[PDB]
Symmetry: D2
Subunit: 150 residues, 4 copies
Amino acid sequence: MLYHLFVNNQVKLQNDFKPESVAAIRSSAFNSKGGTTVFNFLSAGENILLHISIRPGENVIVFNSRLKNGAWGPEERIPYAEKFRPPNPSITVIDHGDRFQIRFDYGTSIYYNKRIKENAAAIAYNAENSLFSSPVTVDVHGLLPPLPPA
Amino acid sequence: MLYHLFVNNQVKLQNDFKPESVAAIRSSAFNSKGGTTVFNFLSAGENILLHISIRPGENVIVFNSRLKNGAWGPEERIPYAEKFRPPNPSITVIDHGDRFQIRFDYGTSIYYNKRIKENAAAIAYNAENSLFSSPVTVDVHGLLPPLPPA
Amino acid sequence: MLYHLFVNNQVKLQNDFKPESVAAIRSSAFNSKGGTTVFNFLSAGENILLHISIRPGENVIVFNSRLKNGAWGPEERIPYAEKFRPPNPSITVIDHGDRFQIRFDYGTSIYYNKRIKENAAAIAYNAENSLFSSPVTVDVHGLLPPLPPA
Amino acid sequence: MLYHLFVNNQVKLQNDFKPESVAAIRSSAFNSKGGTTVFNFLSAGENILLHISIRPGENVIVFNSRLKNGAWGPEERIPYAEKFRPPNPSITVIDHGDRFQIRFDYGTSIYYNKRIKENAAAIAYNAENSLFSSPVTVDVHGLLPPLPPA
Ligand SMILES: OC[C@H]1O[C@@H](O[C@H]2[C@H](O)[C@@H](O)[C@H](O)O[C@@H]2CO)[C@H](O)[C@@H](O)[C@H]1O
Ligand SMILES: OC[C@H]1O[C@@H](O[C@H]2[C@H](O)[C@@H](O)[C@H](O)O[C@@H]2CO)[C@H](O)[C@@H](O)[C@H]1O
Ligand SMILES: OC[C@H]1O[C@@H](O[C@H]2[C@H](O)[C@@H](O)[C@H](O)O[C@@H]2CO)[C@H](O)[C@@H](O)[C@H]1O
Ligand SMILES: OC[C@H]1O[C@@H](O[C@H]2[C@H](O)[C@@H](O)[C@H](O)O[C@@H]2CO)[C@H](O)[C@@H](O)[C@H]1O
């Protein structure tokens, strides 16, 4: 299923993003001078199941969760440098049931254990001076598709 | 290469669309009540190498070519009914040197012999009440990529 | 990388099967009357990092690990029924650093935590009356490849 | 549909290779010192609809056709050099209805007009000292599948 997720907006998923589900986020540009760019996986109740904060100017990507009206939990971080590949940087999120797998263009995957057991109903995109394009292409799968030889 | 082609606009390609090149056009929605939607493959000199005019009312897809300041030549048209598949309708164009191959969601491929011997420098998208999303996700290849077993 | 893994034989990998690596195993046939078929991911020192024992009669798929000259540890098994899809049954293994993820044609993914902290140097295939073809087509990736929209 | 086409043998297609059909041939090796290697697309009547003769020692690839007990027609040739890419060279054949498209690893595609109007029922592989592996992996499609971004 294809979606065009615009900045400072979101897309309501046709089906719940649940275990086995794959979200392929791809940008049609890379604005090297952009600022903090955020991507949230929200539940039907608007809880933030997976928060990804891409901070170029702090050289770190922060992962967290929080309930609609709750506080943030502990931050899980990683170096921002050499993760994205211009001109079409991408982010791939896979629900492995007990945790999420987030793969960027470079480096090994980041594993985030689930903190709020609920499936995702929507994907949000927030940033004032986005690091990526608007919209970004999002192809959500019900499961891993057949893979090409390369 | 990923491009986001907004309606009544166009996208300047990073490299010429030439023989062996494949353009994968995908929309995140299908507006049944949509009007006439047009996709053009333009050359550097703005010649319309391949004109794809989708007409729901008139029930046909019309293919043509035309120089920037010239007149349209004969039309090669086909039935519009049962070509697209909602919610993510698609259009794929492949350059085979002497002719273009066009493929939709349903039916067989359509072949259109080249009339203006030039490569494409940009892809246009026009519509008053587009049949598709805005923008449309467009993936351009230099050659046919590795195929999945399914 | 494409390998043809013949039965009761193995294939020496061009590069270590490590975290982020994906192995796409596919058979060109399914022999219903097949017996116990085994696939092993072996380390340079011939340790059996991941043992996949498919048992049609006993109706289960058994996962285990073992040092070259050591004894098997506890078995992590699952029901065999409705896992494969003829005529081209498949098995996919992905290394996630701390555990392996196994996927068949049907059902959800299976996760097996690593027991022997070593990378795989070869992939073995054993069977008296194999359930699959000989050889089996095997595509190994360094990282997850680009995914088709479907 | 997957097939394992062994040298000096063939594979009977589950379905007729006809217009829109794609055959993806991939070798798991490249024997640079190998000799002439042949791949034939045969009809149910054993007519050779598409003959591909890969001649390294003559630096040419020859295309031809002929009926089960008929003579060869005129040869359509091309340079052999820099077409295949080790260690996993490939050949892709696509039926465009009025002609075939043959793409190797490098160079533009070769277009062969059909000479015997019949669909293919089998694919043969002949060579004394093959340039490729045995078997070769063959994934035949009923039509072009969804393409990955790269
Ligand atoms: O935890 C995610 C959350 O972080 C906020 O920023 C934190 C910052 O990381 C921390 O070092 C500082 O002490 O407190 C800030 C506020 O909690 C972001 O503002 C917010 O957008 C999320 O990304
Ligand atoms: O042929 C492409 C061109 O068609 C124009 O419409 C045609 C119409 O299809 C034809 O039946 C009539 O005879 O002439 C019209 C004008 O030449 C479209 O208006 C134009 O945008 C192109 O799509
Ligand atoms: O556990 C992997 C190992 O199993 C052996 O068979 C086991 C059998 O599954 C178990 O029920 C019994 O208690 O012990 C047997 C031998 O330890 C297989 O023979 C061996 O090949 C591996 O597959
Ligand atoms: O035409 C395909 C056919 O060619 C045969 O070889 C030809 C050769 O190409 C030509 O130059 C010579 O004059 O005659 C030979 C016999 O026709 C191959 O022997 C045969 O296998 C096919 O590849």
